[PDB]
Amino acid sequence: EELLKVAGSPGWVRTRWALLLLFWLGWLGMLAGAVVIIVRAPRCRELPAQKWWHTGALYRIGDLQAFQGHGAGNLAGLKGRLDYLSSLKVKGLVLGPIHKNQKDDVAQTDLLQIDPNFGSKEDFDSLLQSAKKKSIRVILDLTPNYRGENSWFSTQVDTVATKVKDALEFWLQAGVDGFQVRDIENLKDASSFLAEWQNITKGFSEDRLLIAGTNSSDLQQILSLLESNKDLLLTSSYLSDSGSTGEHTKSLVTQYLNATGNRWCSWSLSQARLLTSFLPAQLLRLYQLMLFTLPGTPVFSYGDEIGLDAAALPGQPMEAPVMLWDESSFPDIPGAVSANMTVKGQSEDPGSLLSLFRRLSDQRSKERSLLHGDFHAFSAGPGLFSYIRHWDQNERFLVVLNFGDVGLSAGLQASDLPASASLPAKADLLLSTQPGREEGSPLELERLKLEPHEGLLLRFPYAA
Amino acid sequence: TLLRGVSIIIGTIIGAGIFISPKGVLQNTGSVGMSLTIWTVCGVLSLFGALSYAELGTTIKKSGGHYTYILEVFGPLPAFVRVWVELLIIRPAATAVISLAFGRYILEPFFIQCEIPELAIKLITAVGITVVMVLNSMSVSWSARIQIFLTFCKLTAILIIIVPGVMQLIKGQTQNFKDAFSGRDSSITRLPLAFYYGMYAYAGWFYLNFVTEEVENPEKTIPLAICISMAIVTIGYVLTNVAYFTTINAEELLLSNAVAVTFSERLLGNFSLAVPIFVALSCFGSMNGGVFAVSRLFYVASREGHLPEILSMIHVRKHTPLPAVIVLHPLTMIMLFSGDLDSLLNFLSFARWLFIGLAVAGLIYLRYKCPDMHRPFKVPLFIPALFSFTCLFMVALSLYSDPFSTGIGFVITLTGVPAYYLFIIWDKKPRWFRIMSEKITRTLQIILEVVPEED
Numbered sequence A: 001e002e003l004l005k006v007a008g009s010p011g012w013v014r015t016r017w018a019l020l021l022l023f024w025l026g027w028l029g030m031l032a033g034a035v036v037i038i039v040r041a042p043r044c045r046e047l048p049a050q051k052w053w054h055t056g057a058l059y060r061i062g063d064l065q066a067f068q069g070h071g072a073g074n075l076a077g078l079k080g081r082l083d084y085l086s087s088l089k090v091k092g093l094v095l096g097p098i099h100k101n102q103k104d105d106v107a108q109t110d111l112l113q114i115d116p117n118f119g120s121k122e123d124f125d126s127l128l129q130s131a132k133k134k135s136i137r138v139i140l141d142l143t144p145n146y147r148g149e150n151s152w153f154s155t156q157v158d159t160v161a162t163k164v165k166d167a168l169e170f171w172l173q174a175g176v177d178g179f180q181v182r183d184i185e186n187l188k189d190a191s192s193f194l195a196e197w198q199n200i201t202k203g204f205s206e207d208r209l210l211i212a213g214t215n216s217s218d219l220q221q222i223l224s225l226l227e228s229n230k231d232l233l234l235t236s237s238y239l240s241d242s243g244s245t246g247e248h249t250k251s252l253v254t255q256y257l258n259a260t261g262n263r264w265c266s267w268s269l270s271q272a273r274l275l276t277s278f279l280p281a282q283l284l285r286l287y288q289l290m291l292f293t294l295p296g297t298p299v300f301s302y303g304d305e306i307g308l309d310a311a312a313l314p315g316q317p318m319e320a321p322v323m324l325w326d327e328s329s330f331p332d333i334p335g336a337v338s339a340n341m342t343v344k345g346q347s348e349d350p351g352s353l354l355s356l357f358r359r360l361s362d363q364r365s366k367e368r369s370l371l372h373g374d375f376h377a378f379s380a381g382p383g384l385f386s387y388i389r390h391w392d393q394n395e396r397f398l399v400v401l402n403f404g405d406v407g408l409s410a411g412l413q414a415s416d417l418p419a420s421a422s423l424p425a426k427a428d429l430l431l432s433t434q435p436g437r438e439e440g441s442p443l444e445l446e447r448l449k450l451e452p453h454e455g456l457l458l459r460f461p462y463a464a
Numbered sequence B: 001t002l003l004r005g006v007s008i009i010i011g012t013i014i015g016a017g018i019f020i021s022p023k024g025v026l027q028n029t030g031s032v033g034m035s036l037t038i039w040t041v042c043g044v045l046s047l048f049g050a051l052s053y054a055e056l057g058t059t060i061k062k063s064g065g066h067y068t069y070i071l072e073v074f075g076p077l078p079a080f081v082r083v084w085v086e087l088l089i090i091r092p093a094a095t096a097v098i099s100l101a102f103g104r105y106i107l108e109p110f111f112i113q114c115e116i117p118e119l120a121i122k123l124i125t126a127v128g129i130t131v132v133m134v135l136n137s138m139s140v141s142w143s144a145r146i147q148i149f150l151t152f153c154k155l156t157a158i159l160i161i162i163v164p165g166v167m168q169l170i171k172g173q174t175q176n177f178k179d180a181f182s183g184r185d186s187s188i189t190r191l192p193l194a195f196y197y198g199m200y201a202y203a204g205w206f207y208l209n210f211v212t213e214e215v216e217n218p219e220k221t222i223p224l225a226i227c228i229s230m231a232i233v234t235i236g237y238v239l240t241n242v243a244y245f246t247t248i249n250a251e252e253l254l255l256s257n258a259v260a261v262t263f264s265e266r267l268l269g270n271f272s273l274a275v276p277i278f279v280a281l282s283c284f285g286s287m288n289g290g291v292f293a294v295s296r297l298f299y300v301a302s303r304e305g306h307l308p309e310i311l312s313m314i315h316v317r318k319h320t321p322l323p324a325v326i327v328l329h330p331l332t333m334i335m336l337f338s339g340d341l342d343s344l345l346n347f348l349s350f351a352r353w354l355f356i357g358l359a360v361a362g363l364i365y366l367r368y369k370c371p372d373m374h375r376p377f378k379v380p381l382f383i384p385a386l387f388s389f390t391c392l393f394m395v396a397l398s399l400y401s402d403p404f405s406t407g408i409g410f411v412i413t414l415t416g417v418p419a420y421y422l423f424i425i426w427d428k429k430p431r432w433f434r435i436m437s438e439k440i441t442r443t444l445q446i447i448l449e450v451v452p453e454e455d
């Protein structure tokens, strides 16, 4: 111990200091390199405060006695299939109008009076309470004369600024996360009435939206109905034209995404009617891939995840068809509910139309790109429509849509995408409309050749 | 009484393992209900292992911990290999695994939702290791007061997850548990590796020396303080994983990088302010658990001639294990710079669990041949022949699985068998190894200014 003491002295102590001097230089070097790597590393953008309806699809439910079953229709029964609705990974239920509406009369139609035929507020409170735990927020339609020739009253329902206003306060007290009105062409100068109600709803809380609707396909009418307010998710007949032409389904989408550019929109074929009222059968798979990938929020009626066809199954009312839950869910003249059509006859098939909807909704409601990734669409073959959904550092995407009759090649002449999102030569396939292509095999975009009426969906995370 | 002993031990088992392992377990389990039973099984197996070690230490009474528990039950030959394997595999990898998570959770506040570059994490990890070792080497008192404060911050690091994880159970947020025992395939080929994560969380009872001279009323409060304090820890970890599972679904738990940060940002509003600072303070307390824990092993081993005489000396003043850290430091750098946490943990747990299942298997030998020698505590012969035959079956099966990170561990352990030529050899070639041994001894104890303990 003492021999060590004498040995810590001139000549070999000079070494001792230098050792921890080099050690401290090395440690400060490690720390400085760390902070430089912190500085050099790209700082990502901020998440733009997504609401609940910004995350997943909505789900309109028009006729309860047709969504539930003849005679069995009531508000309580919605608890039975609320797990089915949460299986689709939806985030809303446009449910209604379930208020008291005798007929065609303004003084005999109250919004604040729940319709007894669906069940009173005893079932409604339970509806909300059991909807909250599955994160399936409820939205109620207030179209007052929803049982007459015209959706809005005839002479003048001026009391909408009174009655609907009291509704937008009372029911927001109850806990309904948004509302909706339909055929806002009849609502005389709706742009100010919608202004009042949107002011009420957003000012009440920003986690409370307001959807509208109209039967117009002219963008000028839609823009003039989006006159001042731009947080209103107007669902219109803009796409109601069957279209599918190489430019209509291209030009309409671009031009509407060119009016406000990025402002959040709502994507739906119609305000109330099903997909199949307009779409031929072979495009039912096709459009569901488009609507889930376009920027905005998709809106689906009941049975648009399985394609309720009024042509295959007769007897169905044209406005409100009957949902098929099982092998006897049709109570009228039976014999046409063969397992192909039903829900359970499609929950098992991996290639079923319901399964496609489930995969698409899972991807849409989960991965950060589809929620809020920017949108760029580039030129391609005459019957195509390709685009990309890219965010800051999250996964990319790519979708190809053949709207023609003859199998075409991709013809990807992109040549203008930002260098942050420029296409690679092989992209990881994820799914397809018409199955058969191996889902997971990176496909080549120079030899990318389509089949008629086929979609695609690919992935490429190059520091994306 | 046993009250303080329960606190003493429970301050060791709890740690960063509850933040590092969950995703690892779920990875190679494929389910949620099948993952929450792995945690329970590893909890009961840790109970069995600690309860066996308590008997090993109570029937030998040669103080020194794990090393002495193998020195004479088998012979010096496995004992030297135990020290070799620990100081070449276990302690470096364990430190680098705790600190690879500390470095992540200390950079999480700055990279709020970004992809932290893999090298920044390693650089911050190495800086943290260097800070911890300078703290342990410059002074001791401030390495114990800080350890107490960090134990408190370690308890808080899990009470800050359990409480928000049960406040939503009382609400009724049970949705991820519906198909509990169902998920991916995850065959038996990936069950041992999940076992490794499961038993890594319940770490600390290894280096937990027990004394019959000080502990009040022995044969009473040594097992009655491990039975009723590993059950508490098992319950705590089960509830913590349940809290993780109620919020985070299995899939986004799998794709995540740190679990506590996701749980915080999905529950709390002040998430970055508290959670990836208390988890970091708990990981810092865990890596601070290298405080003399390894140096006592040097002191015990070097006495009967296994480690060099250098490695068991203390500073002239500022008395610290200075030579015991400049040997654990470069190895830790090599591990954390040339390895991955999913591949360092296999490397760690193969060599740990092999030489623990070969240790507790000694009990089944000491009870049969040479029996009835000062046996105050007496476990029934159901726990050793259920812990030995589980370590030596989740390890022997961990070579059919992942042989490129456990195969190297097995090679290094086997290298200990030749490495017994350092201990015994016909001649050390005075000029060619003895001269360098003496010169390095001189230089190493003259540079560090360290002296023998009291010899």
Ligand SMILES: *[C@@H]1O[C@H](CO)[C@@H](O[C@@H]2O[C@H](CO)[C@@H](O)[C@H](O)[C@H]2NC(C)=O)[C@H](O)[C@H]1NC(C)=O
Binding pocket: A192, A195, A196, A199, A203
């Ligand atoms: C409510 O709607 C009106 C239009 O109907 C929005 O426009 C403002 O209306 C108030 C009403 O007194 C005027 O004083 C303002 O000058 C109008 N313009 C602006 C820019 O405020 C109004 O923004 C909407 N939101 C509210 C009032 O919160």
Ligand SMILES: *[C@@H]1O[C@H](CO)[C@@H](O[C@@H]2O[C@H](CO)[C@@H](O)[C@H](O)[C@H]2NC(C)=O)[C@H](O)[C@H]1NC(C)=O
Binding pocket: A215, A216, A217
């Ligand atoms: C929306 O549907 C109506 C239903 O016929 C279309 O026709 C309008 O009907 C209302 C009331 O029946 C009349 O007041 C309008 O003059 C009708 N318009 C036309 C052009 O005939 C209406 O055209 C549809 N909306 C659009 C934009 O075409």
Ligand SMILES: *[C@@H]1O[C@H](CO)[C@@H](O[C@@H]2O[C@H](CO)[C@@H](O)[C@H](O)[C@H]2NC(C)=O)[C@H](O)[C@H]1NC(C)=O
Binding pocket: A258
């Ligand atoms: C549609 O979007 C494009 C680019 O996103 C823009 O089109 C410009 O239109 C004006 C007038 O028609 C031309 O002078 C420019 O040369 C066009 N730009 C390009 C790049 O071609 C514009 O943002 C939108 N179009 C309009 C008419 O506003």
Ligand SMILES: *[C@@H]1O[C@H](CO)[C@@H](O[C@@H]2O[C@H](CO)[C@@H](O)[C@H](O)[C@H]2NC(C)=O)[C@H](O)[C@H]1NC(C)=O
Binding pocket: A312, A336, A337, A338, A339, A340, A341
């Ligand atoms: C479910 O799919 C099968 C397979 O296509 C359908 O069988 C077709 O039925 C149509 C009648 O609309 C025939 O024209 C086709 O020739 C049939 N296809 C084959 C391959 O035979 C079946 O009809 C579908 N289910 C229902 C209820 O229509």
